[PDB]
Amino acid sequence: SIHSFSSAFLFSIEVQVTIGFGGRMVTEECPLAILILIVQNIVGLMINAIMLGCIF
Amino acid sequence: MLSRKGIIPEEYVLTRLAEDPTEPRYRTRERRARFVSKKGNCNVAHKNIREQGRFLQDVFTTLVDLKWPHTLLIFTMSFLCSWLLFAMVWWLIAFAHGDLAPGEGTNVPCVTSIHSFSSAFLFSIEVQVTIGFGGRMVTEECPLAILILIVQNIVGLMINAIMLGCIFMKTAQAHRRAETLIFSKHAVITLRHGRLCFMLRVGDLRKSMIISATIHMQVVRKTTSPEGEVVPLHQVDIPMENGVGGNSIFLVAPLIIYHVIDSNSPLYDLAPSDLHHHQDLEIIVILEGVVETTGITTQARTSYLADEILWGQRFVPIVAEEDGRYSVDYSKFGN
Amino acid sequence: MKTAQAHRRAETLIFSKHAVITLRHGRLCFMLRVGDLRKSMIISATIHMQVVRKTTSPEGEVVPLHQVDIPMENGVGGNSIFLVAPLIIYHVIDSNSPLYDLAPSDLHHHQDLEIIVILEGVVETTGITTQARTSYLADEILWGQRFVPIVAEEDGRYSVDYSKFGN
Amino acid sequence: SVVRSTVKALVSVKKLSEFLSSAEIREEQC
Amino acid sequence: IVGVILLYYILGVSALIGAAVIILLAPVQYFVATKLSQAQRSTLEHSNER
Amino acid sequence: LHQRAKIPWRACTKYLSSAGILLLSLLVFSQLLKHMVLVAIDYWLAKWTDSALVDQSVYAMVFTLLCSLGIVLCLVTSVTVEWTGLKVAKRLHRSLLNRIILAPMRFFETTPLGSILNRFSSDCNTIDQHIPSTLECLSRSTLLCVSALTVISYVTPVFLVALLPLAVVCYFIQKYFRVASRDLQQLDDTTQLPLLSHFAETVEGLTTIRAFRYEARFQQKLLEYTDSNNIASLFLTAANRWLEVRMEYIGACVVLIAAATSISNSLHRELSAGLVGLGLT
Amino acid sequence: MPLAFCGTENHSAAYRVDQGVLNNGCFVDALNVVPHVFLLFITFPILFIGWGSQSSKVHIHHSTWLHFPGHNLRWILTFILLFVLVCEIAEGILSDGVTESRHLHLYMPAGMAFMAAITSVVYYHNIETSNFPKLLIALLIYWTLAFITKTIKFVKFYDHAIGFSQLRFCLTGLLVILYGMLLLVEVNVIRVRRYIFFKTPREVKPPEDLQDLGVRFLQPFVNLLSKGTYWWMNAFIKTAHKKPIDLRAIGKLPIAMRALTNYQRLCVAFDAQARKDTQSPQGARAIWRALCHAFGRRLILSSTFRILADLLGFAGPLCIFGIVDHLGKENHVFQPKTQFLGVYFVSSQEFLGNAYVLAVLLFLALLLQRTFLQASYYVAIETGINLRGAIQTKIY
Ligand SMILES: Nc1ncnc2c1ncn2[C@@H]1O[C@H](COP(=O)(O)OP(=O)(O)OP(=O)(O)O)[C@@H](O)[C@H]1O
Ligand SMILES: Nc1ncnc2c1ncn2[C@@H]1O[C@H](COP(=O)(O)OP(=O)(O)OP(=O)(O)O)[C@@H](O)[C@H]1O
Ligand SMILES: O=S(=O)(Nc1cc(CC2CCCCC2)n[nH]1)c1ccccc1Cn1ccnc1
Ligand SMILES: [K+]
Ligand SMILES: [K+]
Ligand SMILES: [K+]
């Protein structure tokens, strides 16, 4: 379900904020995409932890 | 190849009385040991440490003490290991169920859209990080998969809680802020009101005020009692000669810390002649106080050796009044 | 909140197995050695000494476990200490001190005497105050003994032989 | 070399035994 | 012994003869070493006198 | 910096002032020709085996001639080394005697006169007895190592890529080992000498020790000296074993890499198993 | 043609689960990787934490050590397991070569087991350094799970009737035996320590000589691998590179090498010999017998190490001859052909005809031979030095 930069941004939003619509799913034949997904999840979790600590 | 042996018939008999070591003898003036450095970091070495696993017992404390890169590496490794383990479990479950086999869809697969280890890993990632694409759904005829999902969710929540707690504890640290305190490079001793006193200047850089400021002064030296006791590093508390006697101070501008040398003071029998480098004398000042921002007590440690003491010197004024307020020239801290 | 706990870190403090009493500067004092294992420094160190014993007043009061504060004989009188290497904690036995009428003969096992030392201070890591509690019975007191030196200077720094803590 | 060392060691052991079997300080116990 | 036994299967009698050459030369080297030791003793006593 | 000094200048001056030119040239030529023949015999044997594994003919004479030439070259090298060492020792001793005779009495009085005697006796004995054999063994070892490295490189061109880091590691290990071992040997000597001195003084004054009842103290001192010597020897042997295991591991890695490269090239470059055996051995 | 863990042949026929899941060859292979991945996922955070702590640790500079019982047995078991896993890797590489597809299940579990064994031995070394026996529970669980998986694989092979003629079957049996031995060692260590169920553990203090700060010769009190490789001397060499070595650098000798201790042992041996045989003269043969009775426990060990090195010496020529003989065949396209269930098991003779296998065996044999030679040299030198000290004390 990738058609434009808007679709890519929506997929990125769903991935980072853990929304997961599922229309834009991740295939099993894109190891680079899998690694990018892992890195994005790690970065998002770290950012959330830092922001929560600062807020507290 | 080969070599020879150590066959010594008589060791040349006359080969003796050589002497003349010609040693460099440069270790006499190598260096002087310091109890603590000028920026804290007590230079004390521990030996014969008999640990019983208590170092690894405080896993959370060790994680907090770990630097930011080490903490990030541990976070990444733990998450990757958890993801890989759960993906392997899902792959094994799919293989046991037989849905991995590319056969007819006569039977309901244990987990939908499972085709390879990559698909299993993607499903595990979605489950643990709560992404939920939904293409790889969980069937109602796989109770073992349901239990594995429950266990994975519990483990992920616990790991997230532990990591968040460690991050918060690391963020609460303020040792770097404690390092912002400034102390005089060399201390001075001069008469005040007809009384000799040991002066020292301490200042702060950051505009943030430190609450509950408390400074402790001690002297580290080898003291031997008349009874024959031998103390390698004897520490004696030194009063601040405060108006009320308390160690509480209000530090905004760099203040001068002076201790009046009385008869009871151990410094009552000190001379500038014995103020050389290799002297059994070291002044330790410990400053304590909480930060108005973090509410965490901070400690500042500095050392003043005998060679670092400026006999018969006076600190220059540092605060200058302006039209509307006062100004501090921090370039005059050590003058 | 559970992660913020540091009682296990507080357990890392080391105290002498048996305390000693010996003369210092012509004055008898009760010495004791306390040390720490972990390199992490404990801030705001504060040690309190008390004696637990049954004390009966001339008025007829009966106190089963009477606790009397014991000064540390500090140079300034405060309980604040700077503990890096295992230090010797000594209390000068003066006339006002309750230990002013003690003899080594009455230092047996079944003696109404117990020394309690309470150490308080915050951890530089967690910022949480920690408490260390130890007891020294009369049989645990070594009359006429002296602790051996523990700190030895090296080429570039000082060294502490923790195997000599109780010698 | 090993054989020569063994022969020299045998000679050394014989000489050491002869030295040990020599006179000793008498009346040491008394 | 083990090397000679295995080399007998590996090559045969010629290898055995070649090894026996070194086997016989080893006592020759021992005798040469003894003569060298005697010469070294003579040189050592002369050098001690000097 | 003073300790780390190979000092080739002293060796060069010694060679120039005692050996000359003809002897050094003969020695170098003999060594180079002997090791060239050592390479050539292996190469010829490999070629003969490859040819026999079915122009060319039976090389029953070329191999024998090569072996005879190698034996003669080794004999010439040994004879030249020993003759050069003997002549060097003689000339150096004569020069030292002439210099000592023509020396001022003021310098005689200034000098302790013990170091001069030690250098005249022990150092001269070591030069006369140990320098030639040590030099011959070192030269043979280094030339054999160079020959083996050249053969390995010729068999497998890609060997040098892995060799260079291994060569750097070997250089570092050799430097560190020499730096440690010089001090270790000096300490071993300066610890074994006091033990002999103590034994001599105990033997001389046995009656005095018995009268003074200091036998326990003397035994304690002897035990301390023995322990010092033993621990020094143990540290020296530990350094030797560490160097040995490091070099053995380096050699094993070299063997593994060479074998892997030879196996890879066997199916592609078709070495015909000729150079393979030479490289392996 | 993607990457398939099992055999992709016959439109992925290896993924069938009919006739029982346990009867599938790839299924048990996948199961065997579970203990390895579990051990990796458990140890990696622990190893990272330990390394981070050591990066800023000051107590470890002079920290003592306490070797657990069966330290040498554990180390030799780990070495044998590593050798067996290397052999399994080689056999899998040889076997899957005939198949067009990769057949990752043949060798990937073996590599995972190799990595798991390395991580486990590093973990055991860390636990030996830092006396925390409670952490051995994870290692025990890993050993039990690996043993169970290997037993399942072995019984599956027995049901398939592989027989002793199959190198894969033999290596599986050897791996089962090694896992059982490791489990027994772990159980014995737990029983000795009494730290899991028993309220009062039987802790052991470090030896006094090791606790002494004036001792620097750490060879006697070191891990077996460190002692064999003289790894502890690296720091000494680094210090010697900058600071010249003096008497201060050379620490006091340990208790085991004391000249007084050697003299006392020699006197005890002499008294025992005199009590056993009432021989008034003290002959050379009597002295030799006393020396043998005093130093045999190390002389025999040194001789055994030298014998092992000498035996492993011929492995070089043997491997060279085998490699050249294998390469002497003009036709190399031919491959071993012995199929039982599509795995194409390789017999011993066919397996030994692999040049890479021969090279790996030669490399391992050379490593072991030279290590044993160095160890024998060190043991002989230490024994001779102790004998010299004892003789000097007796002469005095
Ligand atoms: N203006 C300043 N700003 C920041 N740090 C300062 C300043 N003046 C001194 N320091 C700090 O004081 C400590 C003493 O070293 P330094 O010689 O630089 O200072 P000083 O003796 O106070 O010099 P000055 O003559 O500038 O007062 C150092 O840690 C230094 O960073
Ligand atoms: N080197 C050390 N490392 C860790 N803890 C120690 C050490 N020395 C003593 N302790 C602790 O001191 C306490 C007293 O018991 P223990 O008899 O073991 O010590 P000790 O009297 O100080 O002995 P030592 O003779 O070693 O100084 C115990 O809690 C013990 O763990
Ligand atoms: O290579 S060896 O270990 N050599 C060696 C000598 C010492 C003396 C120490 C001990 C005595 C005091 C000085 C230091 N330590 N190590 C080696 C070991 C075993 C057999 C053969 C060799 C080779 N060999 C023999 C003679 N010369 C070289
Ligand atoms: K979601
Ligand atoms: K979700
Ligand atoms: K979904």
Numbering used by the authors:
A (entry chain D): 113 to 168
B (entry chain A): 1 to 335
C (entry chain B): 169 to 335
D (entry chain E): 595 to 624
E (entry chain E): 446 to 495
F (entry chain E): 990 to 1043, 1060 to 1286
G (entry chain E): 1 to 396
What does the paper say about this structure?
Central to this process is the ATP-sensitive potassium (KATP) channel assembled from four pore-forming Kir6.2 subunits (encoded by KCNJ11) and four regulatory SUR1 subunits (encoded by ABCC8). KATP channels are gated by intracellular ATP and ADP, the concentrations of which change following glucose metabolism. This enables KATP channels to couple blood glucose levels with β-cell membrane potential to control insulin secretion. SUR1, a member of the ABC protein family, consists of a canonical ABC core structure of two 6-TM helix TM domains (TMD), TMD1 and TMD2, and two cytoplasmic nucleotide binding domains (NBDs), NBD1 and NBD2; in addition, it contains an N-terminal TM domain TMD0 which is connected to the ABC core via a cytoplasmic linker, L0.
To directly visualize how Aekatperone interacts with the channel we determined the cryoEM structure of KATP channels in the presence of 50 μM Aekatperone, using our published cryoEM sample preparation, imaging, and data processing workflow with specific modifications. 3D reconstruction of cryoEM particles of channels incubated with Aekatperone yielded a map with an overall resolution of 4.1 Å. A model built from the map shows a closed Kir6.2 channel pore with a pore radius of ~0.75 Å at the helical bundle crossing residue F168 and an inward-facing SUR1 with NBDs separated, resembling other inhibitor-bound KATP channel structures reported to date. A clear nonprotein density consistent with the size of Aekatperone (MW: 399.52 g/mol) was observed in a TM pocket above NBD1 in the ABC core of SUR1. Moreover, as in the structures of KATP bound to GBC, RPG, or CBZ, we observed clear cryoEM density corresponding to the Kir6.2 distal N-terminal peptide domain (KNtp) in between the two TM bundles of the SUR1-ABC core, with the very N-terminus of Kir6.2 contacting the bound Aekatperone. Stabilization of the KNtp-SUR1 interface promotes channel assembly, at the same time, it prevents Kir6.2 cytoplasmic domain from rotating to an open conformation, which explains the dual chaperone and inhibitor activity of Aekatperone. Aekatperone comprises a cyclohexane ring, a pyrazole, a sulfonamide moiety, a benzene ring, and an imidazole group. The preferred binding conformation, which accounted for the physical chemical properties of the compound and its surrounding interacting protein residues as well as fit to the cryoEM density, is shown in Figure 5B and C. In this structural model, the cyclohexyl moiety of Aekatperone is aligned with S1238 on the cytoplasmic end of the binding pocket, and the imidazole group is oriented toward the extracellular end of the binding pocket, interacting with the distal part of KNtp. The pyrazole moiety has its two nitrogen atoms coordinated by T1242 and N1245, while the sulfonyl moiety is oriented toward R1246 and R1300, each interacts with one of the two oxygens of the sulfonyl group.
